[PDB]
Design a protein around this ligand. Structure first.
Ligand SMILES: Nc1nc(NCCc2ccc(O)cc2)nc2nc(-c3ccco3)nn12
Ligand SMILES: CCCCCCCCCCCCCCCCCC(=O)O
Ligand SMILES: CCCCCCCCCCCCCCCCCC(=O)O
Ligand SMILES: CCCCCCCCCCCCCCCCCC(=O)O
Ligand SMILES: CCCCCCCCCCCCCCCCCC(=O)O
Ligand SMILES: CCCCCCCCCCCCCCCCCC(=O)O
Length: 448
C-alpha cells in the first residue's frame, strides 16, 4: 500500500459521509414541519456548506496535492474555495448562537425580531461575504502575479507558494475565525450562566409575567413597564414616561435597566404584603407559611387580587394546616387553574414542595437545546485550530524546520472530518431529528 493511496481513500470516504449525512439533515427539515423554525434555516445553510466540501473542496484538496503547473488565478480558486465554505460555516454558527441568545434572555420579542424573511436575508449576505473573504487572494493578494519548470504564465500549484501566509494568519485566522469563535464562546457562556441564575420572588414572576425594559401597553391598553408595573391609565406615552422618571429618579426616555426594574418590583411586593396583612382571612395563613410558599401566595395576589385569593376559604385552611398535598388537589379544581393551567401548576408545585423546582425546570429546559448546538462549535474549533496553529508557527518562525508532511496532511484530513460530525450530533442529542431520520431511512431509503 502507498503512503498516499491511504490519504486519497480516507478523504474519499470522508466525502461520501459528508454528502450523505448532510443531505439527510436537509431532507428532514423539508419533510418535518416541527423542524421548520428559523433556527434550522442556519442549520440547513451549514449543511449546504458541508455537502459542498465533499463534492468540491475535497476533490480540490487531492488535485492540489500534486503541485501541478497551472495559471495563477485558476490555481488560487482550487486552493481558496474551501476557505469560502469555512467562512460560511462560521457565519452560520454565529447566527445560531445569537438566535438562541435573544430566544432565552429576551423571549417576549423573539418572534417579532427573528423571522424567516430576515433569516434568509442574513444568510444570502453571509454567502456573499464568504466569497469576498475566501477568494481575497484571487482579488490581488497573491504571490504569482509578478517560478520555473512550468513555463511562463503558469506556476506550480503549491498552497504555501501561492497563498500568502500573512493572509492566512492575520486576515483568515485572527480576524475571520478566532474573533467569531471567542464571540460565540461569550454568547453561549452567557446563555448557560442565565440558566444557573439564583431564583427568588423576582425571578419567579419574571417567568410568570415577563420582564420589559421599555414602556409597553398591557392587555387593556395601559402603559406599563418592568414586571406588570402599570404607570398610568392616561392615553399619553408622554405622561407615562414622566411617571416613570418620577419613580426611577432620572430621565429614562422610556427605558430602564434590569436592576431598576427590580427595585420597582420590590416596592410592588412590599405593598402587596401590607395588603395581605390587613386582610383578616389572609394574615393567619401568610404568617404560617415559609418564605418560598409566601412567594406563591404573593404570586396569586399579583394575578387575582387580595379579595380574589381570600375566596379560597378551604384551600387556604389546608395551607395553614400544612396539608400541602390536600391543598394542591383542591387548588387544582379551581377556575383559576382552569384559566391559566401552566402558571397555576407552577404556583401549586411551589406550595407542595416549598422549593423553586417548578421555575428552575423552566430554565433548564429552555437551555438544554443550546447545549447541543454549543457542542457543534466546540468540534468545529477542535477540527480547525490545529491547521491554523501550524500556519502560525511557519509564519512567525521562518527559519525553523517546517512541520513534516505527515503532520500537515493529518491536520488537513482532520479539518475535513468536521463536515461529517454534525448529522451524528443531531441524531444523538436532538429528538425531533433522530425520529425524522429513522422515518427517512426506514421508509424512503430501505423502502420499508
Ligand atoms: N498551510 C496549508 N497548506 C495546505 N497545503 C499545503 C501542504 C504543504 C505542507 C508543507 C509543504 O512543504 C508543502 C505543502 N493547505 C492548507 N489549508 C490551510 C488552511 C485551511 C484553512 C486554514 O488553513 N492551510 N494550508
Ligand atoms: C441516499 C440519500 C441519503 C440516505 C442516507 C442514508 C444514511 C447513511 C449514513 C451516513 C449518515 C449518518 C448520519 C447519522 C446517522 C443517523 C442515525 C439514525 O438515525 O439511525
Ligand atoms: C458543479 C456541480 C457540482 C455541485 C457542487 C456543489 C453542490 C452542493 C450544493 C448543496 C446545496 C444544498 C441545498 C440545500 C437547500 C435545501 C433547503 C430546504 O430544504 O429548504
Ligand atoms: C464525488 C465527486 C463529485 C464530482 C466533483 C467534481 C470534481 C472536480 C474536479 C476538480 C479538478 C481540478 C482541475 C484540474 C485541472 C486540469 C488541468 C488540465 O486539464 O490541464
Ligand atoms: C456551486 C458552484 C460552485 C462553483 C464550482 C463550479 C464547478 C467547477 C468545477 C471545477 C472548476 C475548475 C476550476 C478551474 C480549473 C483550475 C485549474 C486550471 O486552470 O486548469
Ligand atoms: C437564501 C438563498 C441564498 C442563495 C445565495 C447562495 C449562493 C451560494 C449558496 C450555496 C449554497 C446555499 C444554500 C443556502 C440554503 C439556504 C437554506 C434556507 O435559507 O432555508
Amino acid at each position: 500500500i502507498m503512503g498516499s493511496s491511504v490519504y486519497i481513500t480516507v478523504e474519499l470516504a470522508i466525502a461520501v459521509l459528508a454528502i450523505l449525512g448532510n443531505v439527510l439533515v436537509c431532507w428532514a427539515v423539508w419533510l418535518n414541519s416541527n423542524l421548520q423554525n428559523v433556527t434550522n434555516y442556519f442549520v440547513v445553510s451549514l449543511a449546504a456548506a458541508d455537502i459542498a466540501v465533499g463534492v468540491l473542496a475535497i476533490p480540490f484538496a487531492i488535485t492540489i496535492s500534486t503541485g501541478f503547473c497551472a495559471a495563477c488565478h485558476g490555481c488560487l480558486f482550487i486552493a481558496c474555495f474551501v476557505l469560502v465554505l469555512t467562512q460560511s460555516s462560521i457565519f452560520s454558527l454565529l447566527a445560531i448562537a445569537i438566535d438562541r441568545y435573544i430566544a432565552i434572555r429576551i423571549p417576549l420579542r423573539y418572534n417579532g425580531l427573528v423571522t424567516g424573511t430576515r433569516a434568509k436575508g442574513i444568510i444570502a449576505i453571509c454567502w456573499v461575504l464568504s466569497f469576498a473573504i475566501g477568494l481575497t487572494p484571487m482579488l490581488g493578494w497573491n504571490n504569482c502575479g509578478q517560478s520555473q519548470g512550468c513555463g511562463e504564465g503558469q506556476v506550480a500549484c503549491l498552497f504555501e507558494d501561492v497563498v500568502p501566509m500573512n493572509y492566512m494568519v492575520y486576515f483568515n485566522f485572527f480576524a475571520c475565525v478566532l474573533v467569531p469563535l471567542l464571540l460565540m464562546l461569550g454568547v453561549y457562556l452567557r446563555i448557560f450562566l442565565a440558566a444557573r441564575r439564583q431564583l427568588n420572588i423576582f425571578e419567579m414572576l419574571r417567568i410568570d409575567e415577563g420582564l420589559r425594559l421599555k414602556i409597553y401597553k398591557d392587555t387593556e391598553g395601559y402603559y406599563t413597564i418592568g414586571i406588570g408595573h402599570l404607570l398610568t391609565k392616561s392615553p399619553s406615552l408622554n405622561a407615562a414616561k414622566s411617571e416613570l422618571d418620577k419613580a426611577i429618579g432620572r430621565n429614562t426616555n422610556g427605558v430602564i435597566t434590569k436592576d431598576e426594574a427590580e427595585k420597582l418590583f420590590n416596592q410592588d411586593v412590599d405593598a402587596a404584603v401590607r395588603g395581605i396583612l390587613r386582610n383578616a382571612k389572609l394574615k393567619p395563613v401568610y404568617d404560617s407559611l415559609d418564605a418560598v410558599r409566601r412567594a406563591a401566595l404573593i404570586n396569586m395576589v399579583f394575578q387575582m387580587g387580595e379579595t380574589g385569593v381570600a375566596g379560597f376559604t378551604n384551600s387556604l385552611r389546608m395551607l395553614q394546616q400544612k396539608r400541602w398535598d390536600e391543598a394542591a388537589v383542591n387548588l387544582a379544581k379551581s377556575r383559576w387553574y382552569n384559566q391559566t393551567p401552566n402558571r397555576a401548576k407552577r404556583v401549586i408545585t411551589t406550595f407542595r414542595t416549598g422549593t423553586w423546582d417548578a421555575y428552575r425546570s423552566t430554565l433548564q429546559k429552555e437551555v438544554h437545546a443550546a447545549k447541543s448546538l454549543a457542542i457543534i462549535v466546540g468540534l468545529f474549533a477542535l477540527c480547525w485550530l490545529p491547521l491554523h496553529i501550524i500556519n502560525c508557527f511557519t509564519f512567525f518562525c521562518p527559519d525553523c524546520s517546517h512541520a513534516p508532511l505527515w503532520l500537515m496532511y493529518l491536520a488537513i484530513v482532520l479539518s475535513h472530518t468536521n463536515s461529517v460530525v454534525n448529522p451524528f450530533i443531531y441524531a444523538y442529542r436532538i429528538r425531533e431529528f433522530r425520529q425524522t431520520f429513522r422515518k427517512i431511512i426506514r421508509s424512503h431509503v430501505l423502502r420499508q
